[PDB]
């Protein structure tokens, strides 16, 4: 009573904020019929069918999604996983030759004038003593003029040589769970009005996260997870016109995308066991790939977004959406990865509206690219082999990445333009309710007890 003594406890429920290296856990599927997905699931331990979620009580925990450390680890994980399936297949070093290209006009449409070049060139056969003359169809975006039937050249190999993607593998994403090692814990904020930063009054401890698809996109988040209640506007600091205004939808918007050209591929040999798969004649008419969205659903969604976007910039301002501008097609336009062919769709019919305080379909033309530089790095590229047959796909739009215009200083004309850019903000939209805590179990408390001697 009058005197107290120190007492040591081991195994106490207390944590601190820290960082570590989480590990993978994916669905088993017996790994039998998988045709060597690039995101290989044989490289990490299978998961547990029955998950555990313990609902903590009485505890409020503060979150900050713009300083999360899981995004960097996930990005490095995805990059390292990708740069392993491209190692064991052909490197296209002998492709740097002076192509001789002409236009192709075999019953073509006026929309696709140009955009396709019949290019003939030289190549080495298996025996390094003879040369073969070959030809192929190259998209306009992958050839640049030289010496300004004029001579052309491949765009990439003035800077670096490409590494042709292996033809059997597929790029279809699959869910990946991220689990924490022993000694750490993963907290998840089970709130609904949580905007990303600040306290959360109802947290839970989860074994590890739900399936996260590594879908790479731009300017329109696809195939993601939707929030309940209403749409949510999250930003690091929404007063400065230098940060994104990431938006999460409430109901998905269905979008179709198609390429109708009937493509045929043809193989060539460029050495001892190295093959180069070129395009080679298109059967029938030639038409441009395109994407389709509904009108009423989109315009209702835009109405909801503009209704929830007026809680920060006043209730009398005029909200005007405008398209992007400039070059560098990979940032200006939608850049999904539908069915092994890399699209680039002109999103200018969607962001054209002005909102004041008081079964049609929108169609989007698209172009297709072959030589790309994903996981943005200097000195590396990739050549995607052609895919035969018509291509169709469906998708769910469940997000947006807006960006303010600014510069009006003293005016009410707040204008928003779409914009992608870095691929880290594509993964910050799925790990915004998660934290890693390190547990320290020692404790000291005062009580009335003395170690008898």
């Amino acid at each position, epitope marked *: 009573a009058e005197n107290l003594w120190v007492t040591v406890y081991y195994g106490v429920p207390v944590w601190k904020d820290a960082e570590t290296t989480l590990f993978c856990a994916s669905d088993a599927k017996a790994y039998e019929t998988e045709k060597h997905n690039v995101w290989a699931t044989h490289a990490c331990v299978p998961t547990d069918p029955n998950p555990q979620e313990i609902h903590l009580e009485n505890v409020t925990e503060e979150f900050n999604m713009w300083k999360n450390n899981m995004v960097e680890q996930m990005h490095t994980d995805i990059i390292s996983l990708w740069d392993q399936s491209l190692k064991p297949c052909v490197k296209l070093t002998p492709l740097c030759v002076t192509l001789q290209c002409t236009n192709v006009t075999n019953n073509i449409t006026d929309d696709m004038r140009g955009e396709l070049k019949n290019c003939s060139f030289n190549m080495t056969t298996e025996l390094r003593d003879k040369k073969q003359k070959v030809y192929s169809l190259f998209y306009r975006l992958d050839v640049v003029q030289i010496n300004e039937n004029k001579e052309y050249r491949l*765009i*990439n190999c*003035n*800077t670096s040589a490409c590494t042709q993607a292996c033809p059997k593998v597929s790029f279809e994403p699959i869910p990946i769970h991220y689990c924490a090692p022993a000694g750490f814990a993963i907290l998840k904020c089970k709130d609904k009005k949580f905007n990303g930063t600040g306290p959360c009054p109802s947290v839970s401890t989860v074994q590890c996260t739900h399936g996260i698809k590594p879908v790479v996109s731009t300017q329109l988040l696809l195939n993601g997870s939707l929030a309940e209640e209403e749409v949510m506007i999250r930003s690091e600091n929404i007063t400065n*016109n*230098a940060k994104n205004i990431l938006v999460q939808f409430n109901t998905p918007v269905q979008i179709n995308c198609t390429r109708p050209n009937n493509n045929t591929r043809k193989s060539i040999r460029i050495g001892p066991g190295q093959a180069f798969y070129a395009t080679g004649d298109i059967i029938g008419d030639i038409r441009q790939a395109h994407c389709n969205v509904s009108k009423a659903t989109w315009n209702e969604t835009l109405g909801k977004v503009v209704k929830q976007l007026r809680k920060h910039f006043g209730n009398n301002t005029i909200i005007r959406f405008a398209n*992007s*501008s*400039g*070059g*560098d097609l*990979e*940032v*200006t336009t939608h850049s999904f990865n539908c069915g092994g062919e890399f699209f680039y769709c002109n999103t200018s019919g969607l962001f054209n509206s002005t909102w004041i305080s008081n079964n049609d379909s929108i169609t989007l033309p698209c172009r297709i690219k072959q030589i790309i*530089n994903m996981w*943005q*790095r*200097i000195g590396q590229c990739m050549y995607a082999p052609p895919i035969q047959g018509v291509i169709r796909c469906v998708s769910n739009i469940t997000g947006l990445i807006l*960006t303010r215009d*600014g*510069g009006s200083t003293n005016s009410t004309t707040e204008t928003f*333009r779409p*914009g992608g*850019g*870095d691929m880290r903000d594509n993964w910050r939209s799925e790990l915004y309710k998660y934290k890693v805590v390190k547990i320290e179990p020692l404790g000291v408390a005062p009580t009335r007890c003395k170690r008898r001697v």
Partner: nanobody
Amino acid sequence: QVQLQESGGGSVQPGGSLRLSCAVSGLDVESVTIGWIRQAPGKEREEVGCISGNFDQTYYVDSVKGRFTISRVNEENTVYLQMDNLKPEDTATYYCVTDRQFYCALHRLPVSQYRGQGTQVTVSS
């Protein structure tokens, strides 16, 4: 810390050539975009052009095309802007900006983190 230093500029009679240079320290100019923007007196910051990191492609605004040229030297870490056939509309202050992003977009160059002090270009009479 990223530092950008501008050199060149001055007064030039209408019709001729000029060469401005921007030297970058704290970075290597091979995997970042470098843009050149201009500010005229009495108007907000317009924008001239940029050179990206994607296969060394360059982009210019509609106003200047076939007159300006942006080049990059990576062994020296330098960016040169060569201007030809100058006109009275070009009297302004020029800055070389960057954002450490491996892509360009010709509407977000005025709003960039890092920026140089700039140089002055006059054409008259």
